[PDB]
Design a protein around this ligand. Structure first.
Ligand SMILES: *[C@@H]1O[C@H](CO)[C@@H](O[C@@H]2O[C@H](CO)[C@@H](O)[C@H](O)[C@H]2NC(C)=O)[C@H](O)[C@H]1NC(C)=O
Ligand SMILES: *[C@@H]1O[C@H](CO)[C@@H](O)[C@H](O)[C@H]1NC(C)=O
Ligand SMILES: *[C@@H]1O[C@H](CO)[C@@H](O)[C@H](O)[C@H]1NC(C)=O
Ligand SMILES: *[C@@H]1O[C@H](CO)[C@@H](O)[C@H](O)[C@H]1NC(C)=O
Ligand SMILES: *[C@@H]1O[C@H](CO)[C@@H](O)[C@H](O)[C@H]1NC(C)=O
Ligand SMILES: *[C@@H]1O[C@H](CO)[C@@H](O)[C@H](O)[C@H]1NC(C)=O
Ligand SMILES: [Fe+3]
Ligand SMILES: [Fe+3]
Length: 504
């Protein structure tokens, strides 16, 4: 067996160091492979409970350029036919349709409007069961999809778990992304968690010119932080073999802000994916919860008000108060920005969110946190308030999905690399919370001069993780690096062991 957290914290490990190229729009995998109103970009999402699930798709090509004319979503129906066998799709559900636009009121900038997006919630599903389905508008010739299939999450209970949960962040759409997704798909996950920073459409000007770093290239010569929205459609098209067969839960990162006319934000993210916002009573696309077997998952918003007085915090208090840890023993959270990353990139950037929410989550025995944002892999030792703590959560950051932005290689503890404190806070959310340490080895300083003892493992490689919850106390975590392709390759592996009698 591998190591486990029961042993206590491990001595920190840094793996010695060894851009990605975006997929072109000529790649067959991103081109429109259907015609007319046939469904494309088909994706499955979980509901709050295993007995319900979402099916989403887009019908119609997008428009990019001059005088875009948003489509009337009421002209194409939203129907899913489904059943327990591919030849008996005898159940039927209907849903809603919408469009979104990406509009810029600046001379020279091109406008975008989407195909018709559809979201349909399937009710009355058996847990742990394979469902065949086809989606589209049966009243339009040729406007129904091929038969697809997905499996619902297992029933909620302390011995009932999805076999494998894949965890990725900051995918983008490069050839390295295809390596990440191929590795992930070959592990046959029952569920994919995507921790923000999806398509990186905002590394492009509206006329399709891209860059590895917007703030380097275009920030000073453009009137707004532009996007090329078709990258989302390319992304959705590329991902369809996964998303149409495997539930995928997304939470927003900073590249989803995509500010546009009227200060509108998150238009693409909010419209394209299905979220269990109503079922989990968040009534927000930016944070929500769901149960997958005996795991209660909380997706939190690093880019919506997280202060103790705000709506998200109030919702989180209620959500945590409803969790029965004899029914869902595992309490796992995901959000975009890491709290305990030790790379220079985004070092202590989400400190205000940690200060707002960490004590609440600790008081409810949060087991594991997954994040993205930092383009590298890191796993923390169990930690609470910068203190190694046997009841603190394990914080794992997998923002290394392979987007075209530079990899995080510099560490804040590298000689002379400690960033200036005032340069760290997230500008979008504001506030300043990152003060010098008052205790421990780094007392008096903003950074350590070596790998902090709460960092168990850090490596500047692309890859993905797999969580295999075994029972009410043990979960096996595996992180796989992209450059390793041989059977059984694993970069980092540990048993996360919870001790409810110790901590709850
Ligand atoms: C929960 O699952 C873990 C891991 O599978 C169990 O621990 C293993 O039990 C087998 C059989 O005794 C041992 O051979 C392994 O070495 C154990 N692995 C580790 C990391 O401890 C554990 O016993 C299970 N707990 C319950 C209540 O069923
Ligand atoms: C894009 O849409 C905005 C808002 O409707 C409009 O002001 C602008 O002129 C449009 N630009 C083009 C090139 O159509
Ligand atoms: C990204 O993909 C390219 C081409 O396959 C490869 O050479 C490169 O090493 C990859 N980058 C990383 C960090 O793995
Ligand atoms: C897009 O416009 C920018 C200038 O705003 C230009 O530098 C770039 O080469 C153009 N890209 C395409 C695909 O036309
Ligand atoms: C975290 O540590 C700081 C500094 O010692 C302390 O002031 C603060 O109260 C602690 N936060 C919690 C929730 O205990
Ligand atoms: C905090 O630590 C940094 C070095 O990491 C130091 O330059 C700075 O002066 C310190 N600020 C205070 C108030 O101690
Ligand atoms: Fe990112
Ligand atoms: Fe990010």
């Amino acid at each position: 067996e591998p190591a486990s957290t029961l042993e206590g914290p491990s001595r920190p490990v840094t793996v010695p160091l060894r851009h990605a190229v975006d997929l072109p729009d000529t790649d067959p995998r991103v081109q429109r492979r259907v015609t007319g109103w046939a469904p494309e970009q088909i994706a499955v999402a979980l509901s709050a409970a295993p007995t319900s699930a979402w099916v989403s798709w887009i019908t119609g090509d997008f428009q990019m350029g001059g005088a875009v004319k948003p489509l009337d979503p009421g002209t194409v129906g939203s129907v899913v036919r489904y059943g327990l066998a591919a030849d008996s799709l005898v159940r039927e559900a209907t849903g809603d349709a919408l469009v979104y636009s990406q509009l810029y009121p600046f001379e020279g900038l091109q406008n975008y409007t989407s195909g018709i997006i559809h979201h349909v919630r399937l009710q009355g599903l058996e847990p742990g069961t394979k469902y065949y389905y086809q989606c589209g508008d049966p009243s339009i010739p040729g406007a129904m999809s091929a038969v697809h299939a997905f499996r619902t999450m297992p029933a909620v209970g302390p011995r009932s778990y999805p076999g494998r949960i894949a965890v990725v962040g900051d995918l983008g759409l490069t050839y390295n992304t295809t390596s990440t997704v191929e590795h992930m798909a070959s592990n046959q996950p029952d569920l994919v968690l995507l921790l923000g920073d999806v398509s990186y459409a905002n590394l492009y000007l509206t006329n399709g010119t891209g860059t590895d770093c917007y703030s380097c290239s275009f920030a000073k010569s453009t009137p707004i932080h532009e996007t090329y929205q078709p990258r989302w459609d390319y992304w959705g098209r590329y991902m369809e073999p996964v998303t149409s067969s495997t539930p995928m839960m997304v939470v927003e990162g900073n590249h989803e802000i995509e500010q546009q006319i009227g200060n509108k934000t998150f238009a693409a993210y909010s419209a394209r994916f299905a979220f269990p916002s109503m079922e989990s009573e968040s009534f927000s696309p930016f944070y929500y919860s769901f149960d997958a077997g005996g795991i209660h998952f909380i997706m939190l918003a690093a880019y919506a008000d997280y202060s103790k007085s705000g709506e998200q915090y109030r919702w989180l208090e209620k959500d945590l108060a409803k969790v029965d840890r004899s029914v869902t023993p595992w309490l796992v959270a995901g959000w975009h920005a890491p709290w305990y990353s030790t790379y220079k990139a985004h070092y202590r950037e989400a400190e205000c969110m940690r200060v707002a929410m960490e004590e609440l989550l600790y008081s409810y025995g949060l087991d594991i946190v997954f994040t993205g944002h930092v383009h590298a892999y890191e796993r923390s030792n169990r930690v609470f308030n910068y203190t190694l703590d046997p009841c603190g959560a394990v914080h794992i950051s997998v923002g290394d999905g392979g987007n075209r932005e530079k990899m995080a290689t510099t560490h804040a503890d590298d000689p002379g690399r400690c960033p200036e404190p005032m340069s760290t806070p997230d500008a979008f959310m504001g506030g300043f919370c990152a003060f010098n340490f008052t205790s421990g080895p780094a007392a008096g300083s903003f950074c350590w001069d070596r790998q902090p003892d709460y960092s168990a493992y850090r490596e500047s490689s692309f890859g993905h993780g797999i969580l295999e919850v075994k029972n009410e106390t043990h979960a096996l975590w595996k992180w796989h690096r992209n450059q390793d392709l041989y059977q059984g390759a694993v970069g980092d592996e540990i048993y996360i062991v919870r001790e409810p009698e110790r901590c709850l």
